[PDB]
Design an enzyme around this catalytic site. Structure first.
Site, mmCIF file in Angstrom:
data_model
loop_
_atom_site.group_PDB
_atom_site.id
_atom_site.type_symbol
_atom_site.label_atom_id
_atom_site.label_comp_id
_atom_site.label_asym_id
_atom_site.label_seq_id
_atom_site.Cartn_x
_atom_site.Cartn_y
_atom_site.Cartn_z
ATOM 1 N N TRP A 160 0.833 -1.195 0.000
ATOM 2 C CA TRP A 160 0.000 0.000 0.000
ATOM 3 C C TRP A 160 0.878 1.260 0.000
ATOM 4 O O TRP A 160 0.564 2.281 -0.655
ATOM 5 C CB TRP A 160 -0.984 0.032 1.201
ATOM 6 C CG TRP A 160 -1.767 1.307 1.149
ATOM 7 C CD1 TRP A 160 -1.563 2.458 1.878
ATOM 8 C CD2 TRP A 160 -2.807 1.602 0.224
ATOM 9 N NE1 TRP A 160 -2.410 3.436 1.450
ATOM 10 C CE2 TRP A 160 -3.188 2.938 0.437
ATOM 11 C CE3 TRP A 160 -3.438 0.871 -0.788
ATOM 12 C CZ2 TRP A 160 -4.177 3.553 -0.308
ATOM 13 C CZ3 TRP A 160 -4.410 1.483 -1.533
ATOM 14 C CH2 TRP A 160 -4.785 2.812 -1.289
ATOM 15 N N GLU B 104 25.155 6.935 -1.352
ATOM 16 C CA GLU B 104 23.975 7.167 -2.159
ATOM 17 C C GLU B 104 24.006 8.522 -2.857
ATOM 18 O O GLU B 104 23.685 8.653 -4.052
ATOM 19 C CB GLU B 104 22.766 7.105 -1.248
ATOM 20 C CG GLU B 104 21.436 7.432 -1.856
ATOM 21 C CD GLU B 104 20.386 7.469 -0.782
ATOM 22 O OE1 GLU B 104 20.334 8.497 -0.058
ATOM 23 O OE2 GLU B 104 19.677 6.449 -0.601
ATOM 24 N N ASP C 190 6.915 5.879 -7.950
ATOM 25 C CA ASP C 190 8.102 5.924 -8.784
ATOM 26 C C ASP C 190 9.318 5.247 -8.148
ATOM 27 O O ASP C 190 9.216 4.663 -7.072
ATOM 28 C CB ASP C 190 8.394 7.359 -9.219
ATOM 29 C CG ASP C 190 8.723 8.298 -8.077
ATOM 30 O OD1 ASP C 190 9.041 7.845 -6.968
ATOM 31 O OD2 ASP C 190 8.666 9.525 -8.315
ATOM 32 N N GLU D 73 9.778 6.136 -4.561
ATOM 33 C CA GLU D 73 8.710 5.854 -3.601
ATOM 34 C C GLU D 73 7.781 7.054 -3.411
ATOM 35 O O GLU D 73 7.289 7.317 -2.304
ATOM 36 C CB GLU D 73 9.288 5.352 -2.273
ATOM 37 C CG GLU D 73 8.409 4.409 -1.516
ATOM 38 C CD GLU D 73 9.097 3.895 -0.263
ATOM 39 O OE1 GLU D 73 9.965 3.003 -0.377
ATOM 40 O OE2 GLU D 73 8.775 4.397 0.832
#
EC number: 3.2.1.205
Length: 371
Positions: A117, A327, A167, A170
């Site tokens: 969800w 990242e 996407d 998130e």
């Protein structure tokens, strides 16, 4: 265009990239996203894992990449019934809720790691098909080893490719994201053009649905000659070059490819570090190693070796003292006021991010720079 000083450092970063990826690969074959980042540790994503696996496959570690594909295949075969039930529900006119879909996060033992969800995404399944086919072609492997898992992914994607979902980042579950559509397209074309899979019952369907994806992008996913972030938007996203290479919506020399690279560079690339999207507030919207690598990869494929190298150099400059790639880095922030809260809640930026290392290996390989 590289001296011995640079070559030595780029070679070492490649060796280290292989080492950190294979050191942290789980016993069961999954690649983790980031073993030390609070909010990601303990989980595997097919998106991160597929690009990581492609870097490892290019590097030549057939064993490690194969164990990743083994892991994914087995995880998907275990969802054969779930997928069959979702398809049966569709056939009854009872379209399943996002809450019933296949997951985004996986635990290393192949269970849902999160509630779809809140993070429903279809791109990873498309990336896995692209990754496993590309790996098998590269190394002369029989795809029957992973075929039953391929079948689950194909059946799922043929049913659900046109559904709104979150996407890669998130966000925005109500929209249909061009780099998600692109990932699915890449996987479907990979299996639909694979001679080993010529007799699969879904063979023709995969190319027809890939054409349907391209129709949808042509109708709603191109503005002012460039791809856009989601259907019906005007903005770009740093993920968009993946729709050129590797996912193949258009050739690297297509005008839409050129315009998309140019738009991403203009709107999102600062000094070689590529932002995700203009509104990004995650850690203040920093510069993402994997996106600089993706842009570099696309520049190389289009013949812009110099541009590719500039992006590879920028990435290498972000390696820490151990050679680990984060990242993202904050040299330029889109929304600097938003960074502090993210650091307070989740800690310092994920380092190493395996996907950063995977993308580094791909770009290094594209430039002929693996040791």
């Amino acid at each position: 265009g590289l001296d011995s000083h640079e070559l030595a450092r780029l070679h070492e970063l490649a060796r280290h990239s292989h080492a950190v990826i294979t050191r942290h690969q789980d016993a069961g074959g999954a690649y983790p996203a980031a073993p030390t980042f609070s909010a990601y540790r303990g989980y595997a994503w097919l998106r991160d894992g597929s690009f990581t696996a492609e870097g490892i496959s290019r590097y030549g570690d057939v064993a490690s990449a194969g164990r990743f594909h083994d892991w994914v295949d087995g995880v998907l075969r275990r969802r054969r019934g779930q997928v069959d039930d979702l398809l049966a529900a569709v056939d009854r006119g009872e379209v399943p809720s996002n809450e019933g879909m296949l997951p985004t996060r996986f635990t290393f033992d192949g269970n849902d790691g999160s509630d779809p969800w809140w993070d429903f995404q279809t791109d990873g399944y498309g990336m896995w098909l692209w990754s496993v086919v590309t790996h098998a072609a590269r190394h002369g492997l029989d795809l029957e080893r992973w075929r039953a898992g391929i079948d689950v992914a194909v059946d799922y994607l043929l049913a659900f490719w046109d559904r709104p979902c979150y996407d890669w980042w998130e966000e925005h579950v109500e929209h249909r994201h061009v780099s998600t559509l692109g990932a699915i397209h890449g996987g479907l074309v990979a299996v639909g053009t694979c001679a080993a899979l010529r007799s699969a019952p879904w063979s023709a369907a995969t190319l027809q649905v890939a054409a349907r994806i391209r129709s949808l992008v042509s109708a709603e996913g191109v503005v002012d000659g460039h791809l856009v972030k989601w259907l019906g938007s005007s903005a770009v996203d740093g993920s968009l070059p993946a729709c050129v290479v590797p996912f193949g919506l258009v050739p690297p020399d297509d005008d839409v490819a050129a315009m998309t690279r140019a738009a991403v560079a203009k709107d999102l690339d600062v000094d070689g570090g590529v932002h995700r999207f203009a509104a990004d507030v995650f850690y203040g919207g920093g510069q993402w190693i994997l996106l600089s690598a993706l842009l570099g990869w696309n520049l190389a494929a289009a013949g812009d070796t110099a541009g590719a190298l500039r992006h590879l150099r920028w990435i290498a400059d972000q390696a820490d003292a151990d050679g680990d790639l984060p990242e993202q880095v904050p040299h330029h922030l889109l929304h600097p006021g938003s960074r502090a809260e993210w650091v307070a809640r989740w800690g310092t930026v994920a380092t190493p991010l395996l996907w950063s290392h995977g993308m580094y290996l791909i770009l290094a390989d594209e430039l002929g720079l693996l040791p």
